[PDB]
């Protein structure tokens, strides 16, 4: 009868090569964004400039990763429900490619938007608190890699911020780009929200597995 612990969370964990590449790309973005006059003009929402690398002080300590289901060893809602799925068991330990379409910043978080393939969507949970469907967006829209958080912000916030951004962008509030950074168009969504839409999507290798701490 004896029950088994679940992981702390399921997700795609980037290889060291991929993790370092994306981490470097994220840091260059914060450096460039912070230098951009359009960003400096609207510093209200955050002769001195703001170093965003310092602002987003809390970074993922290990390799970067895209979380599917936070489980807390079973103490999270729907953890056992998610973990016993056939597709989760089959995909365990398996290698995937994650497509990064954009990098974004809010006063709370910094992260990368992941656009899941159809296969990868099968690994996306259905019972997320405040899902994409709740905001008129397709499931898996809030898939992401967290690059950094403000001091009193928890990592789960990054998914909420991406969702909020995509609801702005969906409803035609994207507008025209305020400018351009090296690797894409820079969009200002107001209220401290910024998005860099990559000219060429970035691909990273990651293994779908369970994290225990
Ligand atoms: Cl979702």
Residue numbers in the entry: 160 to 205, 212 to 378
Paste lines from the article.
2′,3′-cyclic nucleotide 3′-phosphodiesterase (CNPase) comprises 4% of total myelin protein in the central nervous system (CNS), being the most abundant CNS non-compact myelin protein4. CNPase consists of an N-terminal polynucleotide kinase-like domain10, a catalytic phosphodiesterase domain11, and a membrane-anchored C-terminal tail, which contains a cysteine residue that undergoes isoprenylation. The catalytic domain enables the rapid hydrolysis of nucleoside 2′,3′-cyclic phosphates to nucleoside 2′-phosphates. The CNPase catalytic site, lying in a groove between two lobes, has pseudo two-fold symmetry and contains two apposing His-X-Thr-X (X denotes a hydrophobic residue) motifs, characteristic for 2H phosphoesterases 113537.
Tyr168 interacts with the substrate ribose moiety through C-H…π hydrogen bonding. While the Y168A mutation decreases catalytic activity, Y168S retains it, albeit with an elevated KM compared to the wild-type enzyme. An increased KM, whilst retaining similar kcat, is an indication of decreased substrate binding affinity, with a minimal effect on actual catalysis. In the absence of the aromatic ring, the serine OH group appears to be enough to retain catalytic activity; this could be related to differences in water networks or overall dynamics in Y168A and Y168S. To further investigate the binding mode, we also attempted co-crystallization of CNPcat Y168S in the presence of 2′,3′-cAMP, but even residual ligand density in the active site could not be observed. In the mutants, the missing ion-dipole interaction between the Tyr168 hydroxyl group and the His230 imidazole ring apparently causes His230 and Ala/Ser168 to reposition in the active site by ~1 Å. Additionally, loop α3-β2 moves towards the active site by the same distance. These structural features suggest that Tyr168 also has a role in fine-tuning the active site conformation with its bulkiness.
